[PDB]
Amino acid sequence: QYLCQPLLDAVLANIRSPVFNHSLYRTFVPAMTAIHGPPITSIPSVLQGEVARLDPKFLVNLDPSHCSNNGTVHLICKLDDKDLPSVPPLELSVPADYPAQSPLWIDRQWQYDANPFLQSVHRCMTSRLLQLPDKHSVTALLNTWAQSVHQACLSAA
Amino acid sequence: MMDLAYVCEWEKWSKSTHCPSVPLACAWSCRNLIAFTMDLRSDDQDLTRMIHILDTEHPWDLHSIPSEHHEAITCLEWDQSGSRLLSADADGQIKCWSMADHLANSWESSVGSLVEGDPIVALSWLHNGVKLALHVEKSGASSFGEKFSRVKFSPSLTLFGGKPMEGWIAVTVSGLVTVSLLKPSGQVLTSTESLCRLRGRVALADIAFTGGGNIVVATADGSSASPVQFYKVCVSVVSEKCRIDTEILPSLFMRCTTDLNRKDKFPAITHLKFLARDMSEQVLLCASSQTSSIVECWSLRKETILKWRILSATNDLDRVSAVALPKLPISLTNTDLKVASDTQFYPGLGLALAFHDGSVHIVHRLSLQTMAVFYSSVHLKAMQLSWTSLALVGIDSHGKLSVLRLSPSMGHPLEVGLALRHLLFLLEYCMVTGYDWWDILLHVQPSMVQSLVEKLHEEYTRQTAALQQVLSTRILAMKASLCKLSPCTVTRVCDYHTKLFLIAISSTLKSLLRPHFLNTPDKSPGDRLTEICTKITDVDIDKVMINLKTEEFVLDMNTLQALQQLLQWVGDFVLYLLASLPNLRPGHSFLRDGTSLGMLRELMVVIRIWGLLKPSCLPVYTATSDTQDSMSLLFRLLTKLWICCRDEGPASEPDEALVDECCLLPSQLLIPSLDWLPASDGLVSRLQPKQPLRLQFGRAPPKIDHLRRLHLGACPTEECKACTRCGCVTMLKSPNRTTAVKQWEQRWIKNCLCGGLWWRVPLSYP
Amino acid sequence: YCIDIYCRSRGVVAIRDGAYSLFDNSKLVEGFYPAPGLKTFLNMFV
Ligand SMILES: [Zn+2]
């Protein structure tokens, strides 16, 4: 701005000439080189990060079935915990570009029938799924699953 | 003998899977550019339809023309010059690629033929009637007319003058032949006609030419128990249109079918080749079974008047996978066979036969006895010898492209004078023609380099004063490229390139001055200036400038201003040279050359005159004083140096007054810096015998424009061409199309000054 | 009195006179008077 303007006017006047840097060189390099001397002397890794940090309750493994080494990935988890009862395995479909979007829980209504207890597990799980914020992780789904199993143990007894 | 100069492989782009191989083409031009196709087969089949152009001195930089050939490319074929490339595939479609903006990196085809659905099986440019023969027994004869002589050949289809038409002739897998004639205008005439009335399969074909302007095309249908038929084709132009006249010639059958012991083996003729195009009387055939093969040579020789008789045949081989015939046109008669056997000259007498094991056999032309053997340590699917036949290029049954050097005596040890005379003979052959001499520099050892340079200069003398005119810049380029190859002589190459540049400026400045009126006629103002500067030895610049009719030295003050950067180089080189005097450096040769210092004087005088007309054209010197006339100072020191060397038989060592005055020059002015042209990335200096370079494609194991002396930035924004031999860089399009000294810019459109081609360099984008 | 010092490559240092110009030799720098005989003294060490 002040005390520097005519340089700025000269250089902004003379941009887009192909001989521009020639002009700068010819007008500036002999002074500088006299004073200053001569010049100088398969699976996306976000999911591996999630699975590597899970609690040893969960036992997440890939589905033998379904497409592999391609966009989306598919998981069959498990649940081991003395406090919690054995439950249906749970099926997850993680999209490619996994963060910035929410994974999907593959619903299997037919195995969550044939007991009152698994029905309570399923109702409570769909409730906490509706309660979830958007763009949640895989671990949010797995933890809502474990909390759903715990509530269905407590509500029953 | 055989040494692998280098092996260039693709990186990770090999392992073609699930689609089978295809035959490859390969074509080595007169300029050293290989055009070849390969089976890349990754994510597209157009990777088998790309034509790779590889300049043989910088192999990493491989250009890849994406040819629009819907089927596989059968044939590639360079011009008689090196400037166009014919490529034809199955289903017709001959395309004629030409350079775009005279870059060897941009090809584009505007012209082509099309015989749809029929696969082209032979393709050739028409013959332009130039043929020369090399007399090896006159290698010492001290005149180039005795060594290389034109042999009175006639071009097929001469049109209204002595001038041949350019065009091609292709032979399809049916009986069809087609001729396309390119006009001097953009028009193209095509005609197709069957070869004979009995239309039949042509599985292999070849094309030679004759004296008399007749094409001779040989056809075979691969069966090896059926005759190899022959046709004479005569082209004509009837009033608007091409016209083809064919005629049957004597066919031949093949031996190993009349063998009668076991005749059923070798059932496939796999290669048919005339021994050279324009040598239509001899034919090389190659019958093959699944494992073994036979090559044979036949000749038409008359006694039935004309009748094919066999010359020779090999005993039994492996299955021949590729065949390369030589291109060096030796004179082939009996005395020259004798002297080339005595003095072991073997460049034009070899064919190369690859095999289905690794081996490669260089075998004699006339009686096919093996001259050398190279074991690869996988087979060569395409081979091509070079135009001086000292190196053979070859594409393997992988991505690998290798260049082998064949010694000119095939491994038999020669004394140094004979090797000198052989390589000197070849360099003279490349000097008379315009072909490139790179393959020769594969064979030049360092320890002989200096002696070779001496011989070149002695052969540059004793020619007849017009050859000395036309071979000036060729012998400067050959001298520089030879002196690159040895550590004792590596210092001089910069001098040679500046010498070229000096002449390239000097004449052009003397070209620009158009004398407004002829005073003292019969001497052009270049010669008046040189006479006046050589008789007037005055140390002042004013006293020389007075006597030079300075109303003649006038320009329009526009081009006179645009000459600023060339005049800047002149002044800066003079100042650098005079400051370099007190000290082997980039200027050491010029201090004792009287002629170049005379030229620098003449340019300083015309710079002074042009500065008086317009002061902006002058070079600038950052002076450490303000009451100084820097041009007159440098001219005083230049005259005092030059009067040392303009003496007759002098060699006067420079006196101490000049030494102390030129020690004062960094005090009075600032000696800037200069760019010296051969930024050496050539392989021939880098290579060693018995050690092959293993390269990857595209891997490639203070920025100026050297021709228009413009400083590009640190990372330049405008794109550039690089010369392929010296290495000079110019920006591609001119900076100011209005103010452009076209007398200087239009000299280097098609080549550099050293002679090499331009080659587009990619931008950095850091 | 002034004296410039330029460290350079390979254990080399180039010294100068300071008070003089790198341009108009006759003129001198604003605050430094030239040292007489400096060159000879430096030459003794060289
Ligand atoms: Zn060049």
Side-chain angles (χ1 to χ4, degrees), chain B residues 622-628 667-668, chain C residues 23-26:
Chain B
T622 165
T624 73
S625 66
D626 285 31
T627 172
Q628 207 177 15
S667 74
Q668 292 151 304
Chain C
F23 311 104
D24 266 23
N25 291 339
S26 62

Side-chain angles (χ1 to χ4, degrees), chain B residues 417-570:
Chain B
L418 269 187
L420 259 296
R421 202 204 306 173
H422 294 344
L423 298 181
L424 183 77
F425 190 68
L426 285 174
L427 282 163
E428 288 161 304
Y429 164 64
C430 301
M431 200 151 73
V432 171
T433 65
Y435 301 152
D436 198 348
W437 48 80
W438 174 85
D439 40 355
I440 295 165
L441 324 173
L442 283 188
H443 285 89
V444 168
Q445 297 295 116
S447 63
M448 50 205 281
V449 166
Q450 176 72 14
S451 59
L452 187 45
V453 179
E454 307 321 294
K455 308 290 282 308
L456 270 182
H457 182 245
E458 301 173 14
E459 297 317 294
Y460 181 57
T461 65
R462 76 188 165 182
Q463 313 294 322
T464 173
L467 277 185
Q468 295 198 7
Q469 278 186 354
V470 303
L471 303 194
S472 78
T473 63
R474 281 180 200 148
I475 205 154
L476 276 166
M478 286 156 62
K479 269 195 236 163
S481 66
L482 281 178
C483 288
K484 215 179 290 179
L485 261 76
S486 167
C488 283
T489 53
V490 66
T491 76
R492 315 145 62 170
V493 296
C494 299
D495 303 335
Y496 287 113
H497 281 97
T498 60
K499 188 148 181 166
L500 289 158
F501 196 68
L502 183 47
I503 303 168
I505 285 178
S506 157
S507 70
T508 47
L509 292 190
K510 308 174 161 173
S511 159
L512 256 71
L513 35 91
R514 303 193 286 176
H516 184 276
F517 193 45
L518 77 162
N519 303 333
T520 69
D522 314 277
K523 243 79 193 173
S524 42
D527 289 9
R528 291 297 317 117
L529 171 137
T530 315
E531 279 196 20
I532 278 181
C533 288
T534 194
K535 68 180 174 65
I536 302 167
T537 176
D538 276 7
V539 190
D540 200 310
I541 188 165
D542 198 334
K543 291 185 195 169
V544 181
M545 178 182 63
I546 276 162
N547 307 325
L548 195 32
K549 58 153 172 47
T550 73
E551 314 184 326
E552 188 267 302
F553 290 69
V554 168
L555 283 186
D556 48 25
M557 296 175 191
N558 198 0
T559 69
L560 181 57
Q561 188 190 2
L563 278 176
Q564 146 72 38
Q565 291 106 19
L566 314 177
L567 302 193
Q568 180 73 250
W569 178 85
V570 163

Side-chain angles (χ1 to χ4, degrees), chain A residues 57 80-85:
Chain A
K57 280 148 54 192
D80 287 32
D81 181 356
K82 42 158 46 187
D83 315 337
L84 300 186

Side-chain angles (χ1 to χ4, degrees), chain A residues 16 20 45 54 72 89 110-111 113 115 146:
Chain A
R16 299 153 174 83
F20 190 44
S45 201
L54 278 181
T72 78
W110 56 267
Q111 42 183 350
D113 212 4
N115 279 318

